Each structure stands twice: as C-alpha cells, then as structure tokens.
Amino acid sequence: YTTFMKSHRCYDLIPTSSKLVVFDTSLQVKKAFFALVTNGVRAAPLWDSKKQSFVGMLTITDFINILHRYYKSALVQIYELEEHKIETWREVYLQDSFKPLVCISPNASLFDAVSSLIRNKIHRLPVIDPESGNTLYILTHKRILKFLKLFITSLEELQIGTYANIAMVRTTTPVYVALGIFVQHRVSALPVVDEKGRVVDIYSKFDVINLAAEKTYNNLDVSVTKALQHRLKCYLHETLEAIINRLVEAEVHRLVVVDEHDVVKGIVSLSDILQALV
Amino acid sequence: PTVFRWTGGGKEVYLSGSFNNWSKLPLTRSQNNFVAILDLPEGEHQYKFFVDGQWTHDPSEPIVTSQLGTVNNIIQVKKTDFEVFDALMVDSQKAPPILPPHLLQVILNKSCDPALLPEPNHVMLNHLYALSIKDGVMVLSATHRYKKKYVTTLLYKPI
Amino acid sequence: GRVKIGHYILGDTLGVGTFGKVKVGKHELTGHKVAVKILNRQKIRSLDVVGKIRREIQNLKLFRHPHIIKLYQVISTPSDIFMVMEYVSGGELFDYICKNGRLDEKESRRLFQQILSGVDYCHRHMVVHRDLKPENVLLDAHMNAKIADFGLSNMMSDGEFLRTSCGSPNYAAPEVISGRLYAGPEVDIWSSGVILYALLCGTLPFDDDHVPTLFKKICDGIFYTPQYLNPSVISLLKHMLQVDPMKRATIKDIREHEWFKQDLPKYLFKWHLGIRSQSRPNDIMAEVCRAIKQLDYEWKVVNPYYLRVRRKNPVTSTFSKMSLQLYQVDSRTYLLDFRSIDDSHTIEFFEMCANLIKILAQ
Ligand SMILES: O=C(O[C@@H]1O[C@H](C(=O)O)[C@@H](O)[C@H](O)[C@H]1O)c1c[nH]c2cc(F)c(-c3ccc([C@@H]4CCCCO4)cc3)c(F)c12
Ligand SMILES: Nc1ncnc2c1ncn2[C@@H]1O[C@H](COP(=O)(O)OP(=O)(O)O)[C@@H](O)[C@H]1O
Ligand SMILES: Nc1ncnc2c1ncn2[C@@H]1O[C@H](COP(=O)(O)O)[C@@H](O)[C@H]1O
Ligand SMILES: Nc1ncnc2c1ncn2[C@@H]1O[C@H](COP(=O)(O)O)[C@@H](O)[C@H]1O
Ligand SMILES: [Cl-]
Ligand SMILES: [Cl-]
Ligand SMILES: [Cl-]
C-alpha cells in the first residue's frame, strides 16, 4: 500500500482538464471568498505581484478565521472583512508566526505528497511544475485516497483516528462559538450533539462557506442547526478495508466513531487513514 | 553516393573522371536527363563529359582550369552531403484576417465537479480571455497544456 | 548499365509529386519494389521549402499506419535527396473509379474506413495532409487504401491556425477556397467527404467547368445525391460537407455514425476573447504600438496586424513573450487577440496582457 504511493507520480492524479482559480494578494478579501464560491472551488493560490511568486493559499479556514477574529455582532458590519485585502489580512493572521508556501512537483511521488500533507499539517497541496513555475493542480487527501482505493484489489484492533478530547457542539450552539472551536482546536468538523451525548448532525469547515454563498455571515449568533437547514457513522467492530470503502463510497472527509447507542466515541479522518498507510 | 546528371540532348553521353581514371562511363537516359549514381570517397574529384563526340563540362557546375588549359568540372563531396538533416541545415544558407470561429468556443461556459472541464481544441490554447471589469476587478483566463493534461487558470486581479 | 540508389535499381517514373519525381526501385538481389521521391536540393531551396521538407521527413520517418505509405529511408547525396518509400502495385484510387465505375456500398465503406483511419492517425500526430484526393490515395494488390502526398501537409501547433490554400479546387474546403484561417482537421474531413461521394457515386459532388460556379457551389455546400445513395450515408455526407466548420463532422462524429460503424474492423482505431474595438485597423495598431512602448516592452512587427512582444521581469530577471493579432469580427468591429509564447509563466502572461488592456478600447 505504502510502496505503491512511492512509485506513482503526482501527475498520474492530475485530471485530463481542470480549472485553477488564482487570486492577486491585492484583491479585496470579501471578493476573494465570494470567488471561491462562484467558481465552485475550495482553495486558491495567492500571487504577490511585487514578489513575483506564489506566497500562499486562500482556504475556508481563512474565512473561519476572519469571521471569528472580527465578528462584533449581528447589528454591526465586519469592517475588516468588507474592506481588507488578502495581504492586509495575511499580515495580521501571520505576524510573529510565519508559515511559508508548501508545494509539490508533478514528477514527485504520491508518497512525498502524502508526507508533505501530514508533515506541514495541511489539506490542500498545490502541484507546481518547476520549469514553468505554473501551478497546475491542487492535491487533496480525498483524491489521493480515491486513487489508493481505486487500486485496492477492525478499527479497534489497529487504533486509527482521534478518540480523546473530541471537539463537538450542541444543537443550540451559535455559529460564532463553533467558529471559535474550529480556531482553538484546529479540527475540520464539529459533530452536532443532542441533549444527551448522542450525535444528531455534523457542522464542518465546508458548511462555513454557505455563509459566504448565501451572504449570511453578518449573523453568527444563529444556532448551528439553523445554519445547517440549507441542506454518517462507523462502529469500532468494523474492518478498516470496509471503513476505507465507506469514506470513498460516500465521498466524505471523516467518519464518526460511535457506540451502539449512537453516542460519539471518536473520529477517523482521511488525514489519519492516509497517514497510517505511510 | 554521388549523382551525375547531364541535362541536354544526346545520342550517347559518357562520364570521365579522376574517380575512374578518366575512363568513359556510359550514362543512362530517361528523357532529356542522362544519369549515373556512384559513391565517391569524401574529397575533391574532377570529371568531364563525352557528349556525342565532344568533350564538355557542365558549365552550371564548378570548373577548374589546368596549368595546361584543361577545363574540367570539380566536385567537393563533403561529409555533410551524406546525412539528410545535416545537408538540409547546410541548405538553409493588406486587411486584418477574419476571426476563426474556433476562438469563440470556450470550455468555461459550455451534480458535476466545477473543477473538471472539457478538453479544448489545440487552437484555443494559450489565448487570453477575460470577463467584463465589474467592481474595478479584472478577471483573466487561459488554458495551457502540461504534457497530456490541460489547466484553465483564472486570475482575479484589481486595476 | 543500371541507375542504383540503396541497392534498388531505379526504373520507371510512377508520377510527379508536389516537390519531386517518383520512380520505381527494384532491389538488385531480392526484387523488392520501393517508390523513390527525388528532391533536388537546389530546387527545394529555390521554392523555399527546405524547412517544409525537414519537418515532413521528421514526421513520416516515425509514422507507421497500414493506410499511410511507409517512408523506409532518406538517402542524401550532394546533388539530391532520395525518399525511399513503400510501393503499391494498384496505383491511384482515382484511376480505379475511372476504369471500374463507382464502388458498391460495402466496398465504398471499407475503403472509406481505411482512409479515415489514416486521416485520423495523421491528426492524432498533429499532422494535417491537406490535398487529400483519390489521386493521392493509392491501392495495393489486396485493395487497401494508402494515403500518399505529404508535400502540402502541415503541422498543427498549440494555439495556432493555418493559412495556406492548398489542394485541388474540388476537394478543397470552402474556407480554403475562401482563403480564410483554419484549424486543420476540418479541412481534411471535408476532403474525405468529397472522397466518400467519389467512392459511392463515381463522380464529384462539386464540379463545373465554370470555375466561378464551382466556387459558388462549394460555398453553398450544395451537391446532388443520386436516388441509389443510402439515406444514412447521405446523412454522413450532409454532416461531413458542412460549409460551417463549427457545424461540420469530426472523426469522432463519423466514428459514431451508423453507416461508418457497420462492419468496421478492429485494427483501425460571460467570457470574452481579447479586447474588441470599432476603430480603423491602422489606428488600432498605432494605439497598441504606442501602448506597448508606454510599458517599455521589446517587440517585432511581423504582419501589419501581427506583433511578437517581449518583457523583462523586474524581479526574477526573466524574459516573457506573447503575440498580438487583430482579427475582423463584424463589418464594423475588430478584436485584438493575445497568445502566450512558450520557451510563473502563465500569471506573468496575464499580468503582461492586463497592463495593456487598462490602457485600451473595449
Ligand atoms: O529529373 C530531375 O529533375 C527534374 O528536371 C527537369 C528538367 O531539368 O527537365 C525539371 O523540369 C523538373 O522540375 C525536375 O524535377 C532530377 C533531379 N535530381 C535527380 C536525380 C536523379 F537521380 C534523377 C534520375 C534518376 C533515375 C533515372 C533513371 C534513368 C534511366 C531510366 C529510369 O530512370 C533518371 C533520372 C533525376 F531525374 C533527377
Ligand atoms: N500550500 C500551503 N502552504 C502554506 N500554508 C498553506 C497552504 N495551503 C493552505 N495554507 C494555510 O493553511 C491553513 C489551513 O488550511 P487548510 O487545512 O488547507 O483548509 P481546508 O480544510 O479548508 O482545506 C490556512 O492558514 C492556509 O492559509
Ligand atoms: N471533532 C473532532 N474532534 C477531535 N479531533 C478531531 C475532530 N475532527 C477531526 N479530528 C482530528 O483532527 C486531525 C486532522 O483531521 P481533519 O482536520 O479532520 O482532516 C485528525 O487526527 C482527526 O482525527
Ligand atoms: N461524518 C459525516 N456524516 C455526515 N455528513 C458528513 C460527515 N462529514 C461531513 N459531512 C458533510 O459533508 C459536508 C462538508 O464537507 P467536508 O468538510 O469537506 O467533509 C457537509 O454537508 C457535512 O454535513
Ligand atoms: Cl502525377
Ligand atoms: Cl518488374
Ligand atoms: Cl502490392
């Protein structure tokens, strides 16, 4: 499984014809998030004209961050979001802390790609050709796993996933609060739990762009359930081959490791699956 | 292998040359052209023609006049003359057009992955396309091919 | 007293091709026959086709398809260039259709599949044999099509159109007779459509002694379909002989066509472009020239409407190239087209264009 990734090049996973949205750092940050939505893309590489290079990437995490760092109330505009450039914000976001651009060559191996993702603790890896300097594609866990699962011809015994101090929210929890958890915990999804420890839904980093999409971000006081109105479990006594099959079959980013009485016991992410297979 | 061609009429035409100790070699006629192909060692060779009782040289071809007044043709069979690409390299020394309809066939306008796109006709690759400037922000786009795959990159740029 | 090249003794002239004489060659020892194309170096340089031939050889030497004449070897001499190729005893498909009449539905389809297979192989190799006619389709002992004169052929290059008007007026596409710009495969498709009619009918779809009416007829896309023609092949012909290249059949559409598919053997097979202005072409070119210099960019004026411009990167200290071209759209509008020239390159191209656009008309 692991030696298979070491042989296959990043190119072999680049599609026949794809779309790549690139933002200039001087672009207004609000327009930049609206562009992710309009284009139907989840991340975009950032180009600094003065630097003449790709400085970084704009993801939904950036939206989550702006929202939480600057939400005053429902009665008050987020001035920073409405009138901030991508650089004016990246200057704030990362100041005393500096996180340089992570990238991969198309001729580099899939193993090197899986490593780069976990090593730098990331979900989007841009594939840049060295001679052209052009960003070709953006490598995601889902696509790399879908490739491994294409060539594949218990969860308690192997112990894969996070099972301790699981960050989740109540039904009534406001979006702002949940946003704050996404920030301090740095986890992709927050399972929505009922009065009792059982799970009724799941608010993920993705469900946060619906606010950009619907232009509803100016109210983060709304409960997570009200927020999810616009629109999957796995038990410990199940084989990893089946659990891997489930994720790609449903095309989901992580499964909920729940007990018999539908009460959360842990989470197993695509991150962890590809990592354990490296 | 060198070609020896005599353009011009004749009943009988021969080739005498340094390469064959000036012996009369008969040249075959197809029509108006009398020819013989023979490999000659790389270097200088002198030849003359025996065209129907007269000793002549091809005046179109380089000559050499002897200290004795003998006027023969000359040939420099170069190494370069033997290899095709070497020989071809040594050899190489209004109103605006109408818009082809092809350039109006995009892949961005014409359930499914928004990332994925149709394959383009080679003819529209590297061409710049742009959206109307709305909100004082320009949007530029183009499809480029990297090996056997394609990438349509769109830049969001202020102005 | 035999004229030899390779170990083949040169004989009878089969014909006179685009750039040379074609003679038979029968091997000294084996009796094997080859077709030898003789290209005099002085003549191939007099017509400035030396580059054409260099490329033509390059392509054909690596090609290998059962319905494209094989180029065995190229023998160079100080005088001339000898292109040793596969010989086929059956001669022209044209004389076949002259001698015997039109081919039967079955026989026609076979030969059409064979030709189209070859036509496709060329296109799949960014080669477009323009001048595709029964006269250039040879037949072997066993009745197999063989595509032959690549003298008029051209390369298909990413982002660029061809201009050369090439073949026989009959087989020539309307845009070729109109002398308009074209991609390449569509004009081979049209010629192949004319070939299909020639096979089924034994006559030419568009043909007239009065050249002007021949050109009207071609550009009107009107041809007669004799009653004996199967409506399905009429369907295919109507699709292949579309005056609009955008509405014309593709090797894909033909391959999918019911008539074609039949008994087919296994072995074969709001975005806006640039910027548009309603000004005078010369005023437009002047404006764009005084705009390029206003950016301190190097350039080279090719056509009075083509310009190849260069820019030095103020950061990476790298040279970036692009080409600008004015095309006519309406009878009242024109549009300037920007194309990237390949040696981030793409973003640098966008930047280069963007600058020019802000200081320009619509
Ligand atoms: O013919 C040629 O050029 C044409 O000359 C015309 C002219 O001057 O009248 C012009 O009008 C035309 O445009 C021009 O293409 C050649 C150019 N290089 C050549 C090299 C060659 F080897 C032969 C050749 C080979 C074998 C035999 C044998 C002889 C015996 C019979 C079987 O053929 C005869 C001759 C050639 F014919 C040529
Ligand atoms: N290639 C990269 N190099 C460096 N930082 C990156 C890169 N891609 C994204 N980032 C940063 O990583 C952080 C989190 O992003 P990410 O995990 O990719 O979000 P998502 O789960 O929506 O894919 C953000 O601060 C973002 O700017
Ligand atoms: N709600 C959650 N609570 C705790 N850990 C989580 C949660 N969701 C994901 N993780 C873990 O976060 C890590 C990175 O995964 P992810 O951000 O979900 O792609 C993995 O070790 C996951 O198991
Ligand atoms: N374990 C899960 N069960 C059900 N839906 C899920 C799960 N994880 C993610 N989703 C859904 O996937 C979408 C968000 O995608 P993402 O963050 O990329 O996984 C939302 O509509 C979520 O409700
Ligand atoms: Cl002929
Ligand atoms: Cl014989
Ligand atoms: Cl034969």
Residue B92 · residue C50 · CB < 8 Å: yes
Token pair of C243, please?
């005056």
Tokens representing residue C355 in the block:
């600058």
* C 312-351 near A (Cβ less than 8 A): 313-316, 344-348, 351
Alpha carbon nearest to ligand 3 atom 13, residue: A187
Tell me the C-alpha distance between C348 and A47, whole Å: 10
Nearest alpha carbon to residue A120 among A276, A275, A277: A275
| CA-closest candidate to residue A181, choices A272, A64, A63 | A64
**CA–CA dist C355, C256 (Å, integer):** 46
**In a domain? residue C108:** yes
Is the domain of C33 the same as that of C142? Answer: no
Q: Which domain holds residue C9?
A: 4-86
Does C58 lie in the same domain as C168? no
Specify whether C163 is located in the same domain as C201. Answer: yes
The response to whether residue A102 sits with its C-beta less than 6 Å from ligand 2 reads yes
Q: Hey, what amino acid is at C262?
A: Q
Is the Cβ–Cβ distance between B151 and B144 less than 8 Å?
yes
Query: Distance from the CA of A16 to the center of ligand 4, in angstroms?
Result: 27
The C-alpha of B74 sits at a distance from chain C's nearest C-alpha, in angstroms, of: 13
- Alpha-carbon distance of C24 to A213, in angstroms, equals 73
Question: Which residues in chain B (100-129) have CB-CB distances under 8 A to chain A?
Answer: 107-108, 114-120
Beta carbons of C159 and B123 less than 8 Å apart: yes
Q: Are strands B149-158 and C4-5 parallel, antiparallel or unpaired?
A: unpaired
Q: Which residue, of C86, C120, C153, is where some domain finishes? A: C86
* C239/C223 Cα distance (integer angstroms): 13
Work out which ligand 4 atom sits closest to the CA atom of A253: 19
State whether C81 and B87 contact (CB < 8 Å). yes
C163, C154 in Cβ contact below 8 A? no
C131 is catalytic: yes
Alpha carbons C9 and C19: distance in angstroms, whole number: 22
Do C100 and C41 share a structural domain? no
- Residue B91 backbone zone (phi > 0: left; psi -120 to 50: alpha; other: beta): alpha
B56, B77 in Cβ contact below 8 A?
Answer: no
Residue of A nearest to C352 (CA): A49
Q: State in Å: Cα C144 to ligand 7 middle.
A: 9
- What residue of A is the nearest CA neighbor of C343? A132
Whether C152 is in a domain gets the answer: yes
Write out chain C residues lying below 8 Å of B130, CB-based.
271-272, 274-275, 353, 357
Say if CB C54 and CB B85 are below 8 A apart.
yes
- The answer to whether the CB of C50 falls within 8 A of the CB of B91 is yes
Q: Rounded to an integer, what distance in angstroms lies between the CA atom of residue B10 and that of residue A44?
A: 80
Question: How far, CA to CA in Å, does C229 sit from each of A77, C70, C93, C102, C202?
Answer: 74, 34, 20, 11, 12
Coil, strand or helix at C132 = coil
Residue type, C43: K
Please indicate, yes or no, whether residues C129 and C238 belong to a single structural domain of this protein: yes
Residue C270 lies inside a defined structural domain of this protein: no
Question: What is the C-alpha to C-alpha distance for residues B91 and B82, in angstroms, rounded to an integer?
Answer: 13
Experimental determination approach used: X-ray
- The encoded tokens of residue C9 equal 């003794």
Q: Are A104 and A139 in contact (CB under 8 A)?
A: yes
The helix/strand/coil state of A197 is coil
- At A182 the three-state DSSP class reads helix
Under DSSP, is residue C59 helix (H, G, I), strand (E, B) or coil? helix
CA-nearest of C46, C60, C72, C23 to B37 is C23
Residue A47 bridge partners (DSSP): A24, A54
How many domains does chain A divide into?
A: 1
Q: Whose CA is nearest to atom 15 of ligand 4?
A: A206
Which residues touch A272 (CB under 8 Å, ≥6 apart)?
A160, A161, A162
- Scanning A36-75 for CB atoms below 8 A from C yields 47, 49-54
Which one of C63, C86, C109 terminates a domain?
Answer: C86
A155 Cα to chain B: minimum distance (Å): 31
Question: What CA–CA distance (Å, rounded) separates A57 from A104?
Answer: 14
Are residues C31 and C105 located together in one domain of the fold? no
3-class secondary structure, B152: strand
The total domain count for chain C is 2
Q: Could you tell me the CATH number of the domain that includes residue C59?
A: 3.30.200.20
Check CB contact under 8 Å for A134 and B156. no
Q: Is there a domain that residue C206 lies in?
A: yes
Residue A57 CA: distances (Å) to CA of A36, A54, A85, A272: 12, 8, 14, 23
Say which DSSP state A10 is in. G
On chain C, the residues whose CB falls within 8 A of the CB of B32 are none
Beta bridge partners of residue A53, listed in sequence order: A48
For A103, phi then psi, to 5°, come to -150, 170
Q: What is the CATH number of the domain that holds C215?
A: 1.10.510.10
Q: How far is the CA of C12 from the centre of ligand 1 (A)?
A: 11
**C239 shares a domain with C201:** yes
Tell me which of C66, C86, C106 is where a domain ends.
Answer: C86
Taken in order C331, C184, C301, C341, is the CA torsion positive or negative?
positive
For residue C12, give the ligand 1 atom closest to its CA.
Answer: 32
Domain that holds residue A275: 1-278
Alpha helices in A73-152 (DSSP H): 79-82, 86-93, 110-119, 141-150
Pair C114, C240 in one domain:
yes
Q: Using DSSP, how many helices (H) and how many strands (E) does chain C show?
A: 12, 15
Q: Which of C2, C3, C283, C331 to mutate to test the interface with B (most CBs of B within 10 A)?
A: C3
Same domain, C95 and C57: no
Residue of C131, C188, C263, C343 marked active site:
C131
Q: Record the tokens describing residue C290, joined without a space.
A: 């005084």
